[PDB]
């Protein structure tokens, strides 16, 4: 009944809080300056990128190339950690770890990029994006100004984010939405669709209830959200094509092996 769907929602929220250090709540506090915390370092050009290095240096990682490449490389280290976090979260989704291990792999492989863009939107406004767990703020114009094709790499993600952020979802809503994406029965090469769709059916009911309860004045938020799920696949396909382009035209960089695993035999 409704009660069970609320228990699922809350279970997912608590798991979500455990899995993802930087929430939409924390990010929006940083971006509105409603936090007591120190303001993030603003990166708006090459000079400011350089000066911010010590303050945006994640996990004391240091390069052993040009700015465009270094940005892309930093983005890679973050994405890998996002994949790890998303994998941990997925294993908390009731029923997921009981699926065929090959199907768990397939679900993660096609889902992680859709989720990464969903969660990236929590860190963005129309003027830029929070980075290094909220310690830096990279301007949208700076990212645009990078040489091609890198210059047009993040712009699609901003256009998505501005529209998605208008739905005004919080972490408790996103926790369920993300679980819905992971449990997609139409991913290519799934062995056994039925138990995936059974779980997704429950998740979708849980999401619809959650949206009704949490946004009572926001009519058809559930339907608006489901339409964005179909748009996310495009940002992903588009993104995969760009990666394919750069992997050929840029021998000075290469993909982390985790990201190799995910991108290969994908669209």
């Amino acid at each position: 009944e409704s009660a069970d769907l609320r228990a699922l929602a809350k279970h997912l929220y608590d798991s979500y809080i455990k899995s993802f250090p930087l929430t939409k709540a924390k990010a929006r506090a940083i971006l509105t300056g409603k936090t007591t915390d120190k303001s993030p370092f603003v990166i708006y050009d090459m000079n400011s990128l350089m000066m911010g290095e010590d303050k945006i240096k994640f996990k004391h990682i240091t390069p052993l190339k040009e700015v465009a490449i270094r940005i892309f490389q930093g983005c890679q280290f973050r994405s890998v950690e996002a994949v790890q976090e998303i994998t941990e979260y997925a294993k908390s989704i009731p029923g997921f770890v009981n699926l065929d291990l090959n199907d768990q792999v397939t679900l993660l492989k096609y889902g992680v990029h859709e989720i990464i863009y969903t969660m990236l939107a929590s860190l963005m406004n129309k003027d830029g994006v929070l980075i290094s767990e909220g310690q830096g703020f990279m301007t949208r114009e700076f990212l645009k100004s990078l040489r091609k094709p890198f210059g047009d790499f993040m712009e699609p993600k901003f256009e998505f984010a501005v529209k998605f952020n208008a739905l005004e979802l919080d972490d408790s809503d996103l926790a369920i939405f993300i679980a819905v994406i992971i449990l997609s029965g139409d991913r290519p090469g799934l062995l056994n669709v039925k138990p995936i769709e059974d779980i997704q059916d429950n998740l979708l009911q849980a999401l619809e209830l959650q949206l009704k309860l949490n946004h009572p004045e926001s009519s058809q938020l559930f339907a608006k959200l489901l339409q964005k799920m179909t748009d996310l696949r495009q940002i992903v396909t588009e993104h995969v094509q760009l990666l394919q382009v750069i992997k050929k035209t840029e021998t000075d960089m290469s993909l982390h092996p985790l990201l190799q695993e995910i991108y290969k035999d994908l669209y």
């Binding site: 790890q84 994998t87 291990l101 792999v105 993660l108 492989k109 092996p257 985790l258 695993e261 995910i262």
Partner: peptide, 11 residues
Amino acid sequence: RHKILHRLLQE
């Protein structure tokens, strides 16, 4: 195939 993902999933 998917050695790391398998590892993360089984871990």
